[PDB]
Amino acid sequence: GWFIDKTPSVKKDSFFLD
Amino acid sequence: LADLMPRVKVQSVETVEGCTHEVALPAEEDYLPLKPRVGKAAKEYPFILDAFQREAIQCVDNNQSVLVSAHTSAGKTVCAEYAIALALREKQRVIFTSPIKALSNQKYREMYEEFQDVGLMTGDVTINPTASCLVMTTEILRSMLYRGSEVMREVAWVIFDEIHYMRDSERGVVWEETIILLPDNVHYVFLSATIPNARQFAEWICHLHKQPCHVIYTDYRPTPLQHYIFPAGGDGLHLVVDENGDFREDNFNTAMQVLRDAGDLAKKGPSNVFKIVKMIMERNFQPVIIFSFSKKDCEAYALQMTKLDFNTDEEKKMVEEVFSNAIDCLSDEDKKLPQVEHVLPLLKRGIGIHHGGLLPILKETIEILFSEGLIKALFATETFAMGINMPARTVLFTNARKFDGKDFRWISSGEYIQMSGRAGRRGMDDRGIVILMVDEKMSPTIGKQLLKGSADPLNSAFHLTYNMVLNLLRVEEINPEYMLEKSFYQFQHYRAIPGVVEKVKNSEEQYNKIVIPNEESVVIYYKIRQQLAKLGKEIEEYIHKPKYCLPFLQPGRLVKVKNEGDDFGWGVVVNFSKKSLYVVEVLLRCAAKPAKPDEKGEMQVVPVLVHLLSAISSVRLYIPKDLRPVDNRQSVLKSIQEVQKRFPDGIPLLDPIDDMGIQDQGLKKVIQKVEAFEHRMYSHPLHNDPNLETVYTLCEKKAQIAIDIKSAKRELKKARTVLQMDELKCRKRVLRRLGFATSSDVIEMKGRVACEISSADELLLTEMMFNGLFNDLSAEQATALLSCFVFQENSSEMPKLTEQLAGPLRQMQECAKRIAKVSAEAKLEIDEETYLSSFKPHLMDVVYTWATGATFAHICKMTDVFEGSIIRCMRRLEELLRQMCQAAKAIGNTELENKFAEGITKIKRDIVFAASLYL
Ligand SMILES: Nc1ncnc2c1ncn2[C@@H]1O[C@H](COP(=O)(O)OP(=O)(O)O)[C@@H](O)[C@H]1O
Ligand SMILES: [Cl-]
């Protein structure tokens, strides 16, 4: 099927990954 | 319209390998090949003529003008000699016009020993005016054409030595002005160097005098050259160009790398020039010319060599004998001059100097000693290259940069061609050599364009001058408008009209043929859709902005992509990342191209730039985890086919404001114009018509043809424009306000006075003369004041001036301010402070004291200006005085004529006006 999404995604931009 | 444009064709004559032959013709006339010469030749030569000489000869045999474009020393003078021969053989007259006096003198010597029926005419000397073959300076020739017709009485040929003088700014306008004034019945021989636009020149001559004009061109060089570079701080020379003319990038890059690390921070003693001329004498490369753009650097480099000796005691005795004989004419007082003492030790040692700063008799004596081989290492200025062919085996460049304006710049390939052309002597050398000293890093591309690159094109520097305008108002046959329309400057900017006008008609014809739209309302529909498309693209740009669209590029998002026209319909995103700009990988229907309408299509994932997305949807359809299979790719294509069905109104798009967050105000007014134009579109009676697309394509074609007509006419109205009319209107306005001519462009007596002044600012001087400034002055201070008008080359600190001299100076500067205010009042680009300071008064005291009787030795102590520059100025002053006499005589003002005449006698004596050794 299909769905409708008008909302975007985000990133903290301050996260430290590991 | 009234298009009185050039209409000239050009044809290519076939010739033997070694030269190329083209001829510029009026388009209406039918080309006619030169027929063979009839009867014995006009001149035989002591050698076998080269191909390019024969062809040029055949032109003159057929009484047709010819431009010969060959390297210096190729044999261009051979052609001119045949013309002179032919005209004398036919009891006609000839004028061999050269740009510089010094060249005219030397050519007169050549022509005299050879034909003997020749005369000379320059600003300084007049020999045998009734001669059938007159050598004369171009400045003289134009002055004669303005004066009378007897100048060209029975003249059948005019020879223009070195047309490059037209590029010059100080004397290139007189050159072009002259050619425009000659009668059409005259035939011309133009001698030049390799120029890339020789054809354009012949076309101008053909458009101008309504006569065929030939172009003979040859890159033939009778002595091949080896070009070397010397990296600063390097031990020796790298061959950058071999005899074959190939550019060795192998040795050029290795030369610049030595240069790159040579200087301090990158890592007493003698001079580098010293070391280069030294190995020159040890490698049998002499005689050599060392070009230096500064007379002060030229004397230093030559004095460094005083430690060495390049002459045999026999050659010494010869130098001393030739030197003492050339001086015997000078007075005892003048032989003691310091310059005579300082140079003879250098000539004895085989060292020589040549620059405008020397005294004329010494400069010429050195030229003589050089042609005799008694000077084996000559340090000369650039001017020495712009003269008669005095070649050497080797040419050395001390500097590669020259100062122009407010910044430094390399020397042009044209200048390198000019000075390097002196290396390589016709029969004496198997190969001349050129050495170039570099001190700053140099790109390889510019090095290739400088050593092997063609000469700079020959473009007109034509500009307006009051002396020209006034003389054209005096003659009742020509007007200044004619001089501009027929100039080479205007011909070069008229050069785009030929192709443009031909395309306008052909298009204007193709426009009336596709003019078959059923009705005129169609154009309204077309313009509506065209606007929507412009708006459409504008919306896309806002959606392209990654700051706005990236957040909504989630896997499965439907996106429409178009690049440079073609589109791939819709597609689904998978993920995105940076590139090198951003890139998203999207399935699309198809380095591949989109799928055609009849094709069922095959989905394929491809990376595409984010600024290639036209629209973005609200829908995110689900995609399979592993998209490697083909069946899954088809499954996605079928899933979107079902989405397009669930939304027949169109796949929903993201509101750029309510959803994407573009709070920009300009996007508001764009979306408003879209909804309004979409309403206008669906309202148009044609929107529903099934023939819409058939009539919308004929409308699109007819619309593009119209776009061409618009831009074509646009450049045509530019090309057809005369560029210097606004200046002319302003200069005529100045002449009106000052009383030189009337509102009806008729010369007033005051104008006829100014006509006689050509070597200086005619306008200022005639104003000074009419204001009664000279009337109270003595001849000695009258002449000293005029020195300000012939001292253009000034670059020294002023002296302390006595009140007797500053008086008339201050008076003169007052009239100068008035000249500037009226020019500005006419809206002429002039700076008042610049105009007053252009007349350098540095030699007021020098000229004044020479006028009183002081010896030349006495006046040299007064100023540090090089002693030769003083004589060059005095010669210009004497020529200007002679003009001033003619100016006062034009109105019968005999009291002023008697004053300038007196000034002449006061300064015309001793070494300043010593007869040239060539005359
Ligand atoms: N076919 C030729 N063969 C040998 N020497 C020639 C030939 N043509 C010209 N020369 C020589 O070259 C010179 C011709 O005059 P030149 O200074 O070379 O004219 P330009 O440099 O303007 O082309 C003369 O010294 C002449 O001896
Ligand atoms: Cl022939």
Residue numbers in the entry:
A (entry chain B): 172 to 189
B (entry chain A): 92 to 358, 369 to 681, 693 to 702, 714 to 1042
Manuscript excerpt for this entry:
In both yeast and humans, the nuclear helicase Mtr4/MTR4 is central to exosome function. First, it functions as an enzyme to remodel ribonucleoprotein (RNP) substrates with its 3′–5′ unwinding activity, and to present the unwound RNA substrate to the exosome core. Furthermore, it functions as a binding platform for RNA-binding adaptors, providing the primary interactions to transcripts subjected to exosomal degradation in both RNA processing and decay pathways.
Thus, the MTR4-binding determinants of NVL reside in an unstructured region that is present in the human orthologue and more generally in chordate NVL proteins, but not in lower eukaryotes. To identify the arch-interacting motif in NVL167–216, we analyzed the sequences from different species in terms of evolutionary conservation. In the NVL-bound crystal structure, the arch domain of MTR4 is an open conformation, with the KOW domain clearly separated from the helicase core. The NVL polypeptide chain then forms a pronounced bend at Pro179NVL (which contacts Phe653MTR4) and continues to form a crystal contact, docking at the Trf4-binding site of a symmetry related helicase core. Taken together, we conclude that NVL interacts with the KOW domain of MTR4 using a short linear W-AIM sequence.
